[PDB]
Coordinates of C-alpha atoms in Angstrom, one line a residue:
Chain A
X29 CA -34.2 50.6 71.3
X30 CA -37.1 52.0 68.8
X31 CA -38.9 48.2 69.0
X32 CA -39.2 48.7 72.5
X33 CA -40.1 52.1 72.0
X34 CA -42.8 51.3 69.9
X35 CA -44.4 48.3 72.3
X36 CA -44.2 50.9 75.2
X37 CA -46.0 53.3 73.1
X38 CA -48.9 50.7 72.6
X39 CA -48.9 49.7 76.4
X40 CA -49.4 53.6 76.8
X41 CA -52.4 53.3 75.6
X42 CA -54.0 50.4 77.4
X43 CA -54.1 48.0 74.6
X44 CA -53.9 44.3 76.0
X45 CA -51.1 41.9 74.8
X46 CA -53.9 40.2 72.3
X47 CA -54.7 43.8 70.7
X48 CA -51.0 44.1 70.4
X49 CA -50.1 40.7 68.9
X50 CA -52.9 41.8 66.5
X51 CA -51.7 44.6 65.7
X52 CA -48.1 43.2 65.1
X53 CA -49.0 40.0 63.9
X54 CA -47.4 38.2 66.7
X55 CA -48.4 35.3 69.1
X56 CA -50.0 36.5 72.2
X57 CA -47.0 34.4 73.5
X58 CA -44.5 36.4 72.0
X59 CA -45.6 39.7 73.0
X60 CA -45.7 38.6 76.4
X61 CA -42.2 37.6 76.6
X62 CA -41.5 41.4 74.8
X63 CA -43.6 43.0 77.2
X64 CA -41.7 41.0 80.4
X65 CA -38.2 42.1 78.7
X66 CA -39.4 45.9 78.3
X67 CA -40.8 46.2 81.7
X68 CA -37.9 44.4 83.0
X69 CA -35.6 47.2 81.2
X70 CA -37.7 50.1 82.6
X71 CA -37.4 48.5 86.0
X72 CA -33.3 49.1 86.0
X73 CA -31.5 52.2 86.0
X74 CA -27.8 53.1 85.7
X75 CA -25.5 53.0 88.7
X76 CA -22.5 54.6 87.3
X77 CA -21.4 57.9 86.6
Chain W
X27 CA -54.3 54.2 79.1
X28 CA -52.1 56.6 81.0
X29 CA -52.8 60.0 82.4
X30 CA -50.5 63.1 81.6
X31 CA -47.8 62.8 84.5
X32 CA -47.9 59.2 84.0
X33 CA -46.8 59.9 80.5
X34 CA -44.4 62.4 81.2
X35 CA -42.8 60.0 83.7
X36 CA -42.6 57.3 81.3
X37 CA -40.9 59.5 78.6
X38 CA -38.2 60.2 81.5
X39 CA -37.6 56.2 82.1
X40 CA -37.7 55.9 78.7
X41 CA -34.8 58.2 78.1
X42 CA -33.0 56.3 81.0
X43 CA -32.9 59.2 83.6
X44 CA -32.0 57.7 86.7
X45 CA -34.6 58.3 89.6
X46 CA -32.3 61.0 91.2
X47 CA -32.4 63.0 88.0
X48 CA -36.0 62.6 87.8
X49 CA -36.6 63.6 91.1
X50 CA -34.1 66.8 90.2
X51 CA -36.3 67.4 87.5
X52 CA -39.7 67.2 89.1
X53 CA -38.5 68.9 92.4
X54 CA -39.3 65.8 94.3
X55 CA -37.9 63.5 96.7
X56 CA -36.1 60.5 95.0
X57 CA -38.1 58.3 97.5
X58 CA -41.3 59.7 96.1
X59 CA -40.0 59.2 92.4
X60 CA -39.3 55.6 93.4
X61 CA -42.7 55.2 94.4
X62 CA -44.3 56.8 91.8
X63 CA -42.0 54.5 89.2
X64 CA -43.1 51.6 91.2
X65 CA -46.9 52.3 90.6
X66 CA -46.7 53.0 87.1
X67 CA -44.8 49.9 86.1
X68 CA -47.2 48.1 88.3
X69 CA -49.8 49.3 86.0
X70 CA -48.0 48.9 82.7
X71 CA -47.9 44.9 84.0
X72 CA -51.3 44.4 84.3
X73 CA -53.8 44.7 81.3
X74 CA -58.0 44.8 81.4
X75 CA -59.6 41.3 81.7
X76 CA -62.8 42.1 80.5
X77 CA -64.9 43.7 77.6

């Protein structure tokens, strides 16, 4: 998902949630929720063929 | 930010490759990959607290 890929790019640069919120004009709590969902997704892999 | 090797691994995760597929591409044991992925996700899960 490109919005998650965008977020992942900023995380990889080492930006804090506040810096990301500033860049995206989002509340910091929104960024925290998005980061939490993204990391959960990265922590899973396909089980099936 | 992340190092080059970490960035490469993050790329493969972003593509949706399994740990086994990543291990095969990197000539590593699957368990080694699992540990690298765990360390990487832990790092992404933290942020600087200071100036």
